Amino acid sequence: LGLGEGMEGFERELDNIPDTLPDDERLALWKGKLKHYLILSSAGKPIWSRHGDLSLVNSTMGVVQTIISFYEGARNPLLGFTAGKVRFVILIKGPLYFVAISRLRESDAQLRAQLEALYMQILSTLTLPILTNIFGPLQGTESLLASLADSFTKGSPSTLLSALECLRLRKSQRQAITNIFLKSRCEELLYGLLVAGGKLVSVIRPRKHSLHPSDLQLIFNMLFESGGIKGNGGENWIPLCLPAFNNTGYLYMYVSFLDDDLTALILISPSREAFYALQSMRTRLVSQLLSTGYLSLIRSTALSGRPSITSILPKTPLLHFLYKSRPNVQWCMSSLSSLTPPGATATETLLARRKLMSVYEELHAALHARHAHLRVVYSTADEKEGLACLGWSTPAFEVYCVAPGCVGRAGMAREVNRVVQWARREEERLFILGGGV
Amino acid sequence: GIIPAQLGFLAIYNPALGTTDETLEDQIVYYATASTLSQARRRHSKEERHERLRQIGLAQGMVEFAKSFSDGEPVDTIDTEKARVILVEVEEGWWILASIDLTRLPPAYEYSSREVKPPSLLRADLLRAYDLFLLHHGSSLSSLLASQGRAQLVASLTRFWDHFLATWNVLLHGNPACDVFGGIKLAASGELGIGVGEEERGSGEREVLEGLVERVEGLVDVVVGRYGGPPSEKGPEEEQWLGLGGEVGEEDGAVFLGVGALDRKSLRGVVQWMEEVYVWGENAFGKPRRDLSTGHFLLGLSPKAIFVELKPSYHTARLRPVIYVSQPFIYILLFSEITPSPSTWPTLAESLHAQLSPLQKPLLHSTSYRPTQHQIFDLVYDTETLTLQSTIPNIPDPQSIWTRVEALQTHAQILAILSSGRAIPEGERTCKTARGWWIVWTRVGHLRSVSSSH
Predict the structure, then answer these.
(1) Which keywords label this protein (chain A) (predicted)?
(2) B240: which residues sit within 8 A by CB, 6+ positions away?
């Protein structure tokens, strides 16, 4: 894949600005960051800054607060403003103002989606009446938000597509997993859910209640995309809100590692006295899985990464792809090992992932442009080899792909058709179209 | 009963003009709102000024704020709920702040911008208007200030921009794809053939118009372009062609630019003024009135002058324009300021009518020259020479092969994906549609913009 395109200061972009160096070059380093996430109150006093300290960002957030106060006095809320290569996107959620400052050539829609995900995390930690009453506010949530924003900066396909990934299990094996995971329903579980390394495995559901995709994204961005599930390697009775299910219901989540890549079990209950009961869940689940050897199958399927693009489609020129089912609201992709040379450090793979994700981001901006009904978008970056990319946005699915620059339009649109055929061939395997009883 | 997306306000302000507190009021060198522009449209308080100064002050606040973030780039656009504001630095220290209210759909209103011009296109239109203002006034706004004085600059800006904003339509209209690059819009024939053996492409007319600038004194440049069609041999032969306030057609454009002696940036402005004359005859700036003796001559030499920049291989010149008008052609002849004295103008006009009348029929034939699954509409924009040749049809008025809604949709997609790829001042940004429109944009110094239909 083409190296050294577009931005060039991302190798240290995730590195936090130290506090030892004086405040002048400290603010210079903060402003030099490619991406900024800020949360401020109605009065505009600083609430949360992704990179800088609150005192450092106080002046910047005061200036933007004066701007927003004048616009609110003018009855015209601000939705963002563009200064050349940089773009400011502001989303108005109650007393809170969320601003995302992007130098990575990202559209208004993607920044709004990321700010909405941060707001959903805040709403999940603090219930909506409490969110209105606070106008402390982010106790414990600051690290989760910082890590989730870092995941956004590195390129998060799940937030781009507003969908989730899957483990790619055989339909028979996944059906057996769901059957076992429902045979221990305990007559108490509200939302059952099982994940292997950020990839959803199985879901059991009540008859009337439906597990909304927004709740799925909220849970996944809380646990796996933010990586806040790490460190609490044990019994976790985490409080929850699930605003899609109810914006005032203060639900409860049971999280425990399947260490009996790292499989996690997520169980939602509306009662706080049910943790022990959900404890009687997990063992009755785990042993059953350990009786069937299935948990080993989940561990092995998660241990091996995304399927290789050559293995998915033999003799293909595509280097990567990103398929997404709208009706199943779930996505998948090929491995990123093919993007980088086999001997690669964290920096090289990180840069390659960010670069590929920026290509997908500009393609998604092209397809998902309001007042613009674009079905297929193709682009070719020169990279003085080259790179080519296509995005298909039919009402049935959504495909993104990347190939070397020497393919041509038809020579890789054929590959897009082939990967669509592969995805619809394994729609049962790659996605959880249903759930439980 | 929806409300059209009329522009909210437009402000021309120089921050350096007002430094102290009591001199803040002179920062706004021009300000206009729809209430102010109603009188200008029909022709064609302390709290209000307090709002104006707050608006320009917070525009300056955003540019100061984002100067650090963008590392030397001001806030180009501002997206709000009910106003698509843009702020364009036309020149060093001079800014145009224009807020365009979106469509208010029913007092709870639902806001939308389906047909509102994109901020890149709005910036292009404001830059075009600024270039026209410089064409008719001085070399630059800073020079105009430092020469004339603030009162004269305010008066001239007020007149020109009231007229423009009265005539300005902020919705999608005409051919924005030609207008998003600016540039010199060429006709369907494009340009007259220069070499020998291209008589069908206009070699003889090219030679005659080339030798005209030496045959008559004072004349430096001849700019002619086809706008409309040949005269109709009917009752109303006039047809009011020179006015009509309409839009330039896809086949309407310059057919013969100058020999040289004039910078291509100024040639763009001259061609745009010629388009304004075609659209706003008897109403464009300078008040072009047809000569009572012969209706051919418009804006006679017998004063009025326009400001251009000349080619270095030949500098601001302040040439005097004269607009010879045939029914399909608009010859703009730019004379020197001092050598063709107006006393000889009645004779010289006759000589002009002697040397341009035999260039009606042959040049009409020459301009008729015309240079693929169903239909191919490509837009070739030469960056170096600023020439734009577009086969893409313009948006119809409220037979044409397009309909209004399809034109709006596909045309909004065209310049949107142009803005995505930074086309505006290989890159094969091919884009398909659900309606069968196949855009192929390539970067060659040509901004090729092919667009297949169905």
Answers:
(1) Autophagy, Endosome, Membrane, Protein transport, Transport, Vacuole
(2) none
Q: Pick the closest to residue A268 from A239, A247, A248 (CA basis).
A: A239
> Based on the domain organization, do B74 and B198 belong to the same domain?
no
Q: Considering CB atoms only, which of A81, A372, A377 is closest to B79? A: A81
User: B323 with B208, same domain?
Assistant: yes
Inspect the interface and report whether the beta carbons of A76 and B80 lie closer than 8 Å.
Answer: yes
Method used to determine the 3D structure = cryo-EM
Is residue B104 within 8 A of residue B26, CB to CB? The reply is no
B307 lies in the same domain as B444: no
Which class would CATH give A309-430?
A: alpha beta
Is B183 domain-assigned? no
Edge-to-edge order in the sheet of strand A397-404: A330-333, A320-325, A397-404, A387-392, A374-381, B430-433, B438-443, B447-453, B375-376
Same domain, yes or no: B162 and B301:
no
Cβ of B70 under 8 Å from any chain A Cβ?
A: yes
B429 and B351 both lie in a single domain: no
**CATH, range A23-157:** 3.30.450.70
One domain, residues B253 and B320: yes
Residue B392's domain comprises 375-453
**Is the Cβ pair B416, A372 closer than 8 Å?**
yes
Class (C level, CATH) for A171-303: alpha beta
Strands (E), B181-290: 184-185, 219-226, 253-256
Answer yes or no: are the C-beta atoms of A32 and A81 closer than 8 Å.
no
Domain finish residue from B367, B391, B420: B367
Of B61, B81, B431, the CB nearest to A366: B431
- Asked if A60 reaches chain B (Cβ–Cβ under 8 Å), the answer is yes
> Looking at CA atoms only, how far is residue A90 from chain B in angstroms?
10
- Facing A79 at nearest CB: one of B70, B73, B80: B80
CB contact under 8 A, A88 and B427: no
Domain ranges of chain A: 23-157, 171-303, 309-430
Whether B176 maps to a domain, the answer reads: no
Among B307, B333, B367, the domain boundary falls at: B367
Dihedrals phi, psi of B400, to nearest 5 degrees: -95, 135
Q: What does DSSP say about strands A374-381 and A252-257: parallel, antiparallel, or unpaired?
A: unpaired
For every residue of A149-163, DSSP letters joined together read HHHHHH--HHHHHT-
Q: What CA–CA distance (Å, rounded) separates A123 from A139?
A: 13
Contact across the interface for B61 and A374, Cβ inside 8 Å: no
Resolution (A): 3.0
The answer to whether B444 faces chain A, any CB pair under 8 Å, is no
Residue position matching structure tokens 């004339």: B148
The number of domains in chain B is: 3
Handedness of CA B173, B177, B182, B185 (dihedral sign): negative
Instruction: Give me the residue label for tokens 């059209």.
Output: B4
Chain B contact for A403 (CB, 8 A cutoff)? no
DSSP B3: B
Contact (CB<8Å) B428/A380: yes
Query: Nearest C-alpha of chain B: how many angstroms from A344?
Result: 29
Q: Which residues pair with B381 in a beta bridge?
A: B388
Specify whether B148 is located in the same domain as B219: no
- Under 8 Å CB-to-CB from B32, ≥6 apart: which residues? B9, B10, B11, B161, B162, B165
d(Cα A277, Cα B369) in Å, to the nearest integer? 86
- The partner residue sitting opposite B432, judged by closest CB among A64, A83, A374, is A374
Q: How far apart (Å, rounded) are the C-alpha atoms in residues A343 and A350?
A: 13
Q: CA–CA separation, B101 vs B80, rounded Å? A: 9
Render A14-65 in DSSP notation, one character per residue: SSPPPSSS-HHHHHHHHHH-SEEEEEE-TT--EEEESSS-HHHHHHHHHHHH
Residue A366 burial (C-beta neighbours within 10 Å; 0-12, 13-18, 19+): buried
Angle of helix B345-356 relative to helix B203-215, nearest 10 degrees? 160
